[PDB]
Enzyme design. Structure first.
Site, PDB file in Angstrom:
ATOM      1  N   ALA A   1       7.920  -7.695  -6.080  1.00  0.00           N
ATOM      2  CA  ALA A   1       7.158  -8.644  -5.284  1.00  0.00           C
ATOM      3  C   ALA A   1       5.686  -8.599  -5.695  1.00  0.00           C
ATOM      4  O   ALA A   1       5.196  -7.597  -6.234  1.00  0.00           O
ATOM      5  CB  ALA A   1       7.313  -8.341  -3.805  1.00  0.00           C
ATOM      6  N   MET A   2       5.007  -9.713  -5.440  1.00  0.00           N
ATOM      7  CA  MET A   2       3.600  -9.925  -5.748  1.00  0.00           C
ATOM      8  C   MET A   2       2.626  -8.955  -5.075  1.00  0.00           C
ATOM      9  O   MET A   2       1.455  -8.899  -5.445  1.00  0.00           O
ATOM     10  CB  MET A   2       3.228 -11.345  -5.341  1.00  0.00           C
ATOM     11  N   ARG A   3       3.088  -8.215  -4.073  1.00  0.00           N
ATOM     12  CA  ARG A   3       2.204  -7.280  -3.388  1.00  0.00           C
ATOM     13  C   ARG A   3       2.221  -5.909  -4.068  1.00  0.00           C
ATOM     14  O   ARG A   3       1.373  -5.061  -3.776  1.00  0.00           O
ATOM     15  CB  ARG A   3       2.583  -7.193  -1.892  1.00  0.00           C
ATOM     16  N   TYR A   4       3.160  -5.721  -4.999  1.00  0.00           N
ATOM     17  CA  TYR A   4       3.308  -4.459  -5.748  1.00  0.00           C
ATOM     18  C   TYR A   4       2.924  -4.561  -7.201  1.00  0.00           C
ATOM     19  O   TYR A   4       2.891  -3.561  -7.907  1.00  0.00           O
ATOM     20  CB  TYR A   4       4.759  -4.008  -5.784  1.00  0.00           C
ATOM     21  N   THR A   5       2.668  -5.765  -7.667  1.00  0.00           N
ATOM     22  CA  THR A   5       2.421  -5.929  -9.075  1.00  0.00           C
ATOM     23  C   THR A   5       0.960  -6.223  -9.334  1.00  0.00           C
ATOM     24  O   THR A   5       0.291  -6.818  -8.495  1.00  0.00           O
ATOM     25  CB  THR A   5       3.409  -7.004  -9.576  1.00  0.00           C
TER      26      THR A   5
END
Lengths: 462, 458
Positions: B87-91
């Site tokens: 997900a975009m919150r981890y990358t």
């Protein structure tokens, strides 16, 4: 999650509002597309991809949802018929006037800021509200909305006499007040939930009986529905009770509601009794509902059932804390600005010899030292506290001063301010030193918001 | 949508890169969370709860997706085996170095900006790209395969020295595509037909070796866009239903550092024949339909490779001319302020006195443009008669600037700005001098980013 008892918000609610505040998305300024706000929220504060953020935006702009909206929005945001708001690309949004009073003084070190999901931005952990939002918009839990005028009144009565009894609280706050209006009837259930935190009341729809002047025929007109009752599902449940002969006396059902007003229409078969039909409507549909008041909020990281005096206490304790931090902060700032102007006023009283040493220096770093190393001629409770008994900071202010500052009124401007700052510091310490001046400030703020936002009661209490 | 023929991007591609540039998400600085970039795009340039934006971001960062990556990411972005990105919150994300080259000079009025979905924000219609991204990175209707940067750059230098460049000569610099995934192309006719027409078909083989004790097939590289995991399972199905011959086993031993699909051969039964039925029944071999379409003034169009190089060079003629016009105008103004600053200095003490003797700033200014001081051509701005602005630069000049070496730096800058406007004129007036600057630029990206051909052409 549960909302904080002081500002009445849940984390997502603040993230949305703080975002709108950082964006200069004010009530005076032009509406921005909802998408924009959803963007900064996801981007800096709620990295998710849901509709939590958008739903939150939608919910705060619905007059049938909040007794005092926080979002002033244009476009399609849904209805009491339960239809959905249009896509974030098609709704315009902006903070409401009252929302700014919940964010007042955020820039004056009034509340603790926390880090965001990645540590590159910060968010208040609570809002510096001048408004008792938790009670006023209401919110496991189930706290109903209340009237801003009544609540401020209780709040003032409470600051004038902390020994305020529950019975006195009830003269000031007779009970909830829904945005949706209506009629409350469970009078002892109100006191029940106020002394206890838990109670149950009856909310009824407002309705009148017209008689057509010529046919003598009767019609019941429903003007107000109870909080949260979906109008369209209700006409469906009504049509059904007629279909199954479970509800007699009705010859026709129609909604003629508007963007401008609710108008449910229930035709009475010739000869039948208007009042009796109305009475049977109140027994078989959501024309009447129960509401369970269960008042829980987070106080210092923990769920808690509150009685109404405690809710008023929390809001007032929070105002003492915000006003105190605000004044601490203003006094530190005034002493720092006073120190720089002072440094500029003796500088301006001897501006010509000051001119060289700038000439005779080979860079800016070294210019300054010629000002901290030679001692100057001329022409206390105002000293910052970080200030030693005898600076670099002042010389930065002179050495970085603009040429046009020597102008006649500029000179006079940098010393009326200096002088005005000395009255500010004096005024500021009275307020901090004196519990009374401070409560006095809190009382004028409450009267100020009661003046600008206070409105009539909507729901009738029988 | 289709990509612009000049920068090879589709609207969202461009909306994403512009957001990162504006946000300072440089190849140089710290990684930012993808979610910070996604949210900015959605709120300012592309209002959708889609995944088109996050998707645009992940693809730009896959070494197996782009021949020259446009995003440099940290974290899980998927793999040739088909895993989703995290997900975009981890990358984490940042523009790659070559990405700054597609955006170079967006700050010097080189390209037309345009309104976003509402008013309130403006955005480039194309990028001032010093890189021929359309060919180099290709696009997916349309279906343009990637190519070698070194080869394309050379095709461009050549086109500049001779605009009657033949298709035959182009083929010598660009013999065909060059996929990020290596492999082997066969069928030159397809390559030449497509380059001359805009439509061709080619075949793309995996590169495998046969080890000769029995034999084992070792696959080192797969055709472009084929999923390794889907492939091995496809092979497993074939051998289990006995629809595929003598294979005793198959393992995927591919790792961080490279691909190793292993397929063992039963006992004799010869691997050259298994490899063949393997190219014929699986994505070991795939065909590729070249269909080179793009927008030019809006309006799709089928382009031949020559037209594609012409479009890119022409775009470089426009960008550089405009960039030079901007610098010249910008250097005249800056030089006009520093010449003033210099006549205010070395005539200062008297200057002090004016602001002194005035009850305002507007009146300090007025008694600067109501005096003719003492002292101590084609470098002047065009709005200047044969100065008020210079005096705004005086009135607002900081005290510490009367210092010895602050005094020498406004003088040094002045002088150095005089030589630059001179150079700037030589380039604007001489077409040939302008083409030199373009060649210098192509050689520069080629020296920094050009690389070895990966794909073999047979």
């Amino acid at each position: 999650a549960l909302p904080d008892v002081r500002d009445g918000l849940k984390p997502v609610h603040r993230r949305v509002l703080f975002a709108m505040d950082v964006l200069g998305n004010d009530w005076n300024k032009a509406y921005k597309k909802s998408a924009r706000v959803v963007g900064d929220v996801i981007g800096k504060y709620h990295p998710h991809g849901d509709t939590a953020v958008y739903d939150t935006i939608v919910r705060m702009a619905q007059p049938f949802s909040l007794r005092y909206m926080l979002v002033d929005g244009q476009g399609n945001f849904g209805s009491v018929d339960g239809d959905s708001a249009a896509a974030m690309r098609y709704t315009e949004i902006r903070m409401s006037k009252i929302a700014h009073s919940i964010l007042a003084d955020l820039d004056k070190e009034t509340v603790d800021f926390v880090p965001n999901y990645d540590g590159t931005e910060h968010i208040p952990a609570v809002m510096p509200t001048r408004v008792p939002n938790l009670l006023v918009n209401g919110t496991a839990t189930n706290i109903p909305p209340h009237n801003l005028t009544e609540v401020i009144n209780a709040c003032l009565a409470l600051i004038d006499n902390s020994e305020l009894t529950f019975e006195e609280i009830l003269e000031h706050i007779p009970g909830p007040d829904f945005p949706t209006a209506g009629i409350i009837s469970g009078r002892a259930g109100i006191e029940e939930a106020y002394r206890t935190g838990r109670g149950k009341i009856k909310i009824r729809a407002r309705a009148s009986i017209d008689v057509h002047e010529t046919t003598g025929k009767e019609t019941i007109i429903v003007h107000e529905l109870p909080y949260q009752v979906n109008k369209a599902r209700l006409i469906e449940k009504m049509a059904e009770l007629v279909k199954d002969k479970r509800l007699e006396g009705i010859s026709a059902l129609r909604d003629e509601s508007d963007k401008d007003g609710m108008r449910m229409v229930i035709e009475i078969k010739r000869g039948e009794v208007g009042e009796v039909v109305l009475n049977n409507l109140y027994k078989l549909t959501q024309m009447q509902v129960s509401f369970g008041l269960n008042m829980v909020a987070l106080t210092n990281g923990q769920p808690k059932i509150f009685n109404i005096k405690e809710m008023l206490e929390a809001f007032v304790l929070h105002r003492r804390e915000v006003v105190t931090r605000r004044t601490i902060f203003e006094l530190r700032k005034a002493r720092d600005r006073a120190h720089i102007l002072e440094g500029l006023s003796i500088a301006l009283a001897n501006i010509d010899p000051i001119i060289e040493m700038i000439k005779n220096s080979n860079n800016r770093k070294e210019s300054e030292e010629k000002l901290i190393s030679q001692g100057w001629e001329l022409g206390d409770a105002a000293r910052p506290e970080w200030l030693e008994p005898e600076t670099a900071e002042q010389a930065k202010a002179i050495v970085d001063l603009q040429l046009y500052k020597l102008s006649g009124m500029e000179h006079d401007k940098i010393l009326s301010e200096y002088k005005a700052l000395l009255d500010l510091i004096a005024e500021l310490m009275h307020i901090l030193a004196t519990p009374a001046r401070l409560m006095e400030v809190i009382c004028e703020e409450l009267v100020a918001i009661r003046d600008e936002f206070g409105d009539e009661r909507r729901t009738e209490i029988t």
